[PDB]
C-alpha cells in the first residue's frame, strides 16, 4: 500500500505512476487507466526491462482450434483455485532432483505459437526451446488466483510466456527493494513476457478480483542456461529434456 503505483503505456513501452491506482483497486479502474495513461506525460516513468506485451497476437480462429486442443485434454486439481495441464518435467526444486518419466513431449499448437513468436521477433522471442508448457486456469467463481511470486530460476530460463485465452486479466508486479508496484493489463488474445528485471527484480502475480469469467493462460518456459548445451545438468538431464520438449503430442482430430 505504502507504494508508488504505476500503469503500463504499451503504445510507448513505459509506466506512467499515478495515486488514483491503489493495491485493491478494481480491474476496471486498471483498464481504464490503461487508456487513459498515454494522455500522461514521461515524468515519473520507469521503463520495465524485460516486459513485452503483444495486442492480438493470436487470432480468434487461431485461439479457438487451440482451446478445442485445450479442453479435449483432461484438467488436473491446482492450489489457488487454479487448474493445470502441463507439458513439462515434474522438479523437485528443494532438492534439484528432475523425472522425465512423465514427459511424453509438447503440445501440438507449440509449433504454430512458437513460429508465430519468432515472426513478431527472433530477438525477442525467438531461438525458444520449450521445457514447460503449462495451461492454467482460472474462475471467478471459485475466486481462482496465483499468489505474488517469481518462478524458479534454476531449470526455467529468463523468458516467460503467457497468452491470454478466454479471456484477459490484470498482472500485478511488484518491486519490494524500490518499493514500486505496477498494473500490466493484459487483453483477450494477448502474449506477455517477463523476462530480466520482471522475472528477477519484480514479482510477478494476478489477483482473483482481476479475474472475470473463466481465462487460461497458456504459459511457456524456456531452458535454464545450465540445462542447456554448455550446462552442468545437460548430459544427466538437459538433453532428454530439449529432445522430449521437440516431441510433439497429437492433440486435434483430424
Known amino acids: 500500500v505504502n507504494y508508488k503505483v504505476f500503469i503500463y503505456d504499451h503504445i510507448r513501452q ?5 495515486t488514483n491506482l491503489n493495491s485493491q483497486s478494481s480491474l476496471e479502474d486498471i483498464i481504464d487507466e490503461s487508456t487513459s495513461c498515454q494522455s500522461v506525460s514521461t515524468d515519473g516513468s520507469i521503463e520495465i526491462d524485460g516486459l513485452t506485451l503483444i495486442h492480438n497476437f493470436l487470432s480468434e480462429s487461431e485461439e479457438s482450434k487451440i482451446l478445442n486442443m485445450i479442453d479435449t485434454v483432461k484438467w488436473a486439481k491446482s492450489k489457488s483455485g487454479r487448474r493445470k495441464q502441463d507439458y513439462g518435467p515434474k522438479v523437485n526444486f528443494k532438492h534439484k532432483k ?7 513431449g509438447m503440445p501440438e499448437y507449440a509449433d504454430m505459437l512458437l513460429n508465430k513468436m519468432s515472426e513478431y ?10 521445457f514447460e508448457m503449462c495451461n492454467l486456469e482460472y474462475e471467478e467463481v471459485k475466486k481462482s488466483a496465483i499468489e505474488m511470486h517469481q518462478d524458479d530460476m534454476w531449470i526455467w530460463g529468463n523468458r516467460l510466456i503467457s497468452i491470454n485465452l478466454i479471456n484477459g486479466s490484470v498482472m500485478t508486479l511488484s518491486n519490494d527493494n524500490k518499493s514500486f508496484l505496477c498494473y500490466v493489463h493484459m487483453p483477450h488474445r494477448s502474449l506477455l513476457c517477463m523476462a530480466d528485471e520482471c522475472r528477477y527484480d519484480w514479482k510477478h502475480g494476478v489477483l482473483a478480483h482481476h479475474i472475470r469469467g473463466r481465462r487460461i493462460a497458456l504459459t511457456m518456459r524456456e531452458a535454464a542456461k545450465d540445462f542447456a548445451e554448455g550446462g552442468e545438468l545437460y548430459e544427466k538431464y538437459g538433453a532428454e529434456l530439449i529432445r522430449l520438449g521437440n516431441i510433439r503430442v497429437p492433440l486435434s482430430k483430424t
Open 98 to 104: 528432475v523425472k522425465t518419466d512423465t514427459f511424453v
Open 14 to 18: 513505459i509506466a506512467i505512476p499515478t
Open 121 to 130: 521477433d527472433v530477438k525477442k522471442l525467438g531461438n525458444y526451446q520449450p
